[PDB]
Amino acid sequence: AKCVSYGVSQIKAPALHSQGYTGSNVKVAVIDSGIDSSHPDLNVAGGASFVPSETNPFQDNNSHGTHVAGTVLAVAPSASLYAVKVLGADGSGQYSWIINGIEWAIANNMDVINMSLGGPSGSAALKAAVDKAVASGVVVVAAAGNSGTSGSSSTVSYPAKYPSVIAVGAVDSSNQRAPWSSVGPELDVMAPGVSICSTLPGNKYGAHDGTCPASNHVAGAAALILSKHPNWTNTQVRSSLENTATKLGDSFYYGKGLINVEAAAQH
């Protein structure tokens, strides 16, 4: 039944909830596989599809974007989620689709973009779009990737790897890096990403593992901070999260450490 992530307490969102800050009026674009807006535990504020063969962003056959929505709302329950569908049934999207998604978020005045997606390769056009979003004042959050460690190599995927993006890696209930959490100098912060229980299509609930759930907590945290400091820039929101993180291990593996949204929202 009504599953709340252990990660909501781990990042200290309850401190903000009890001050009456729950991400009210903050527009968050979930750029992903869609959101089952059927689910009676989710609010969805609107959406768009850039998958040519799947015009419905409110149908989630992959079941990924529905899980993403629940975790963002578990952290920021009165945020306005927008279902920006850029991934098809095979679980991938063309760069053009993802870019159309980012352009859509810019044109429709999103405060936060969550990208629980990545590839091994970037494009000039993807980097341009992401940089443009951040230049226009959008907080852009992305999953660091699930490619683990690879000796001395960065394994952080695009677009998390871009400096303009907040790359999020995954820890468990003990603040230990998940072994599949991508690593490298481009990694910014960590959040819970192991057995994260959230909403699934058809009024269901279930655990997922990944940097996807980790980034969902950070996107929610951005929404809480802007709830309380509506006049903060994306720059100030990003600084608050990075400078107040609980230091864990070396920054190659853990970046700045675990986000503390309570500490971030005083800063």
Author numbering: 1 to 75, 85 to 276
What do the authors of the reporting publication say about this deposited model?
Omniligase-1 is a broadly applicable enzyme for peptide bond formation between an activated acyl donor peptide and a non-protected acyl acceptor peptide. The enzyme is derived from an earlier subtilisin variant called peptiligase by several rounds of protein engineering aimed at increasing synthetic yields and substrate range. Mutation A225N in the S1′ pocket and F189W of the S2′ pocket increased the synthesis to hydrolysis (S/H) ratio and overall coupling efficiency, whereas the I107V mutation was added to S4 pocket to increase the reaction rate. The final omniligase variants appeared to have a very broad substrate range, coupling more than 250 peptides in a 400-member library of acyl acceptors, as indicated by a high-throughput FRET assay.
Crystals of variants containing a Trp at position 189 were only found after a long incubation time for Pre-4 (Ptl-M222P/L217H/A225N/F189W) and Pre-5 (Ptl-M222P/L217H/A225N/F189W/N218D). Mutation S218D in Pre-5 is involved in the S1′ and S2′ pockets but has no influence on the structure. The structures of Pre-4 and Pre-5 each contain three protein molecules in the asymmetric unit (molecules A-C). In both of these variants Trp189 is involved in intermolecular contacts which are different from those in Pre-1-Pre-3. In addition to the role of Phe189 in crystal formation, we observed that for both Pre-4 and Pre-5, crystallization resulted in at least one substrate binding site occupied by a peptide sequence. Variants Pre-4 and Pre-5 crystallized in crystal form C containing three protein molecules (A, B and C) in the asymmetric unit. The structures of molecules A and B are highly similar with an RMSD (root-mean square deviation) of 0.3 Å. They have oxidized cysteine and an unoccupied active site like ligases Pre-1 to Pre-3. In crystal form C the structure of molecule C is more different with RMSDs of 0.6 – 0.7 Å to molecules A and B. It has an oxidized cysteine and a bound eglin fragment (41′-46′ (SPVTLAG P5 -P1′)) that was used as a crystallization aid. In this crystal form C, we also observed a crystallization artifact; part of the loop from Ile205 to His217 of molecule C is forcibly drawn into the active site of molecule B, mimicking a peptide substrate.
